[PDB]
């Protein structure tokens, strides 16, 4: 399934279950609590472990806060008395926040930030804590009312939850779980490798789909390469971000793959050209918001190596091309044109397709491999303003066809290997040499590129990402399992 980063550079999606399980393991939830000397009443009870539950979106996180052995006193001129319950599940809505990590980084070029619950807010339209009106699994409720209670026990319970909220307002910090930690590379410049995967701005998002929680995720969203966030960015994860095959998913935007790897590399295929003929734009079909393609600028053409055709030396040229990401594939469409001096033009529109996958070199190290999918698909037509005879036209179109069927796969192979080059070595300058000497048996390990991409984000304090999947699915998509340090 094709996925998308939704205009972010990098996306790291972990199922909510994994996050909750980590919380229950580390037991950051406070045990006993008590509100003393409150104006509107007081209360006490015990918490069971807090957990993320469904109903959130983007910034907004729903927490299930199970409470037991609860009692409360309500103080008021109207509602007044003592009560409690044996068990209840309080639901609140909160936000999370990225805060400076401590101890800081020694490298002052890197700022470590932690993802933790936001404990306070001075914007009334954005309360730190919102009590949700849900009255689920309440057991052993009791209350002694000095006057009125025709409206149910639900009303008293809502009051209780607000007392619990008062305590929470002063004690949320007691829940200091670090969801993840992110290395912000401020100051990226000069000879930096993998700049398109080093985060320079980070935010998060809760995403749920119906069927819930089991399929819901918490996402780390990064802008990289010195880029920052904007209204252009939404706090959302695509439903297909995590490979169906894997626990967690990491995405590198197809836009970055194209602008930062292929666009600087593609001129080196044509020392004939000037080198300024290519561009990455936003125009392609169909679903989603928008897609990215690498094409010739309007008006430009690229001369190719000469061919012999029906007795004449001709220079084929690229009249139009599109490099783009679709489904599982890197796709290349090249329109080559050849003009015979007799007054006939050949036009071939040739499409090649490439898949990526997780592989290993001969030292058993994980790497990225590729393969061409089938053979070129071609469309050929012609224009005959010279009134050239059929026999010449047919022979001419044979020669130009043969050129397209040879040239365009060679072009696609260069691009495919070029892209692996960029991903594996992270330096644009070194890609041509990588392509020239590429060999799947000997291709470098992906580990260094992982250190500079995915491992720039650390979940649950010390998790290690165990890669088990690589594919192109619009953006480069990594599949893997978080290894919790056994301890």
């Amino acid at each position: 399934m094709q996925t998308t980063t939704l205009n972010w550079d990098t996306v790291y999606a972990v199922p909510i279950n994994i996050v909750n399980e980590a919380i229950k393991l580390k037991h950051p939830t406070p045990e006993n609590f008590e509100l003393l000397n409150g104006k509107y009443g007081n209360c006490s009870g015990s918490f069971e472990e807090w957990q993320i539950t469904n109903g959130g979106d983007g910034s907004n996180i729903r927490l299930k806060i199970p409470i037991k052995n609860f009692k409360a006193t309500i103080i008021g001129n109207r509602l007044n008395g003592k009560g409690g319950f044996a068990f209840a599940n309080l639901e609140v809505q909160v936000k999370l926040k990225y805060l400076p990590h401590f101890p800081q980084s020694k490298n002052k070029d890197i700022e470590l930030v932690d993802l933790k619950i936001r404990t306070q807010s001075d914007n009334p339209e954005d309360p730190a804590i919102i009590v949700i009106s849900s009255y689920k699994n309440i057991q052993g409720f009791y209350f002694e009312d000095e006057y009125k209670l025709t409206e149910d026990d639900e009303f008293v319970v809502s009051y209780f939850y607000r007392l619990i909220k008062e305590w929470l307002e002063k004690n949320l910090h007691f829940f200091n779980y670090i969801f993840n930690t992110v290395n912000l590379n401020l100051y990226i410049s000069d000879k930096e490798k993998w700049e398109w995967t080093k985060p320079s701005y980070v935010d998060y998002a809760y995403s749920e789909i119906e069927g819930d929680l089991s399929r819901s995720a918490l996402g780390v969203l990064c802008m990289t390469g010195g880029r920052t966030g904007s209204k252009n960015q939404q706090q959302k994860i695509d439903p297909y971000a995590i490979p169906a095959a894997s626990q967690s998913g990491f995405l590198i935007s197809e836009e970055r793959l194209l602008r930062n790897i292929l666009l600087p590399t593609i001129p080196k295929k044509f020392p004939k050209s000037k080198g300024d003929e290519f561009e990455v734009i936003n125009e392609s079909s169909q679903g989603g918001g928008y897609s990215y393609i690498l094409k010739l600028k309007k008006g430009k053409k690229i001369d190719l190596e000469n061919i012999q055709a029906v007795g004449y030396t001709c220079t084929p040229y690229i009249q139009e091309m599109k490099i783009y990401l679709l489904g599982s594939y890197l796709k290349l469409e090249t329109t080559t044109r050849v003009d015979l001096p007799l007054g006939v033009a050949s036009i071939c529109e040739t499409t090649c397709e490439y898949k990526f996958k997780l592989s290993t070199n001969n030292k058993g190290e994980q790497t990225i491999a590729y393969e061409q999918i089938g053979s070129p698909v071609n469309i050929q037509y012609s224009e005959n303003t010279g009134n050239v005879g059929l026999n010449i036209v047919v022979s001419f179109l044979s020669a130009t066809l043969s050129f397209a069927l040879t040239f365009v796969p060679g072009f696609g192979t260069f691009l495919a290997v070029g892209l692996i080059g960029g991903c594996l070595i992270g330096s644009v300058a070194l890609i041509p040499t990588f392509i020239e000497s590429y060999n799947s048996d000997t291709a470098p390990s992906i580990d260094l590129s992982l250190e500079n991409s995915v491992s720039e984000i650390t979940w649950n304090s010390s998790d290690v990402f165990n890669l088990d999947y690589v594919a192109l699915a619009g953006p480069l998509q990594l599949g893997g399992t978080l290894q919790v340090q056994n301890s």
């Binding site: 979106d57 936000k95 309360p127 919102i130 009106s133 809502s158 009051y159 607000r162 706090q235 959302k236």
Partner: protein, 141 residues
């Protein structure tokens, strides 16, 4: 319409008046719409079991913030037949199809300064006049 009639009735409280609604621009919850409700005029009454008014609160200029899932946009049909009210059905609890919730019942705390009691009742009142009437939100800009 800009302003809407609202009516709320339950055993121990009731309220009526008119409200202005507006969509609130936001970038934190892409799948939800935020709405700001401003009370143009109205009173909140607390009553006892036999209907006697125990307390009343002027709602005028109270400001509330709510949110619901954008699934409500698929509601049909925004036809005018005829006058739309935000009214609840007394003692008839309804399903919450679009995960409607209250973000803040009284932003400037005009009434909830009085305490939790007012917050809780105002919260209940807001859900009760909105639920089932979400098709009314279609026309709010």
């Amino acid at each position: 319409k800009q302003a809407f009639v609202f009516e709320f009735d339950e055993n121990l409280s009731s309220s009526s008046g008119s409200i202005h609604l507006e969509k609130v621009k936001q970038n934190c919850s892409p799948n939800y719409d935020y709405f700001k409700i401003t009370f143009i005029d109205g009173y909140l009454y607390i009553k006892n079991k036999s209907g006697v008014i125990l307390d009343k609160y002027d709602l005028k200029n109270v400001i509330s913030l709510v949110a619901l899932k954008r699934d409500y946009l698929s509601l049909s049909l925004s036809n005018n037949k005829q006058i739309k009210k935000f009214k609840n059905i007394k003692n008839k609890h309804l399903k919450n199809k679009f995960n409607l919730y209250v973000i803040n019942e009284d932003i400037e705390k005009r009434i909830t300064k009085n305490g939790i009691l007012e917050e809780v009742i105002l919260n209940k009142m807001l859900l009760s006049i909105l639920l089932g009437n979400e098709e009314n939100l279609l026309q709010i800009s």
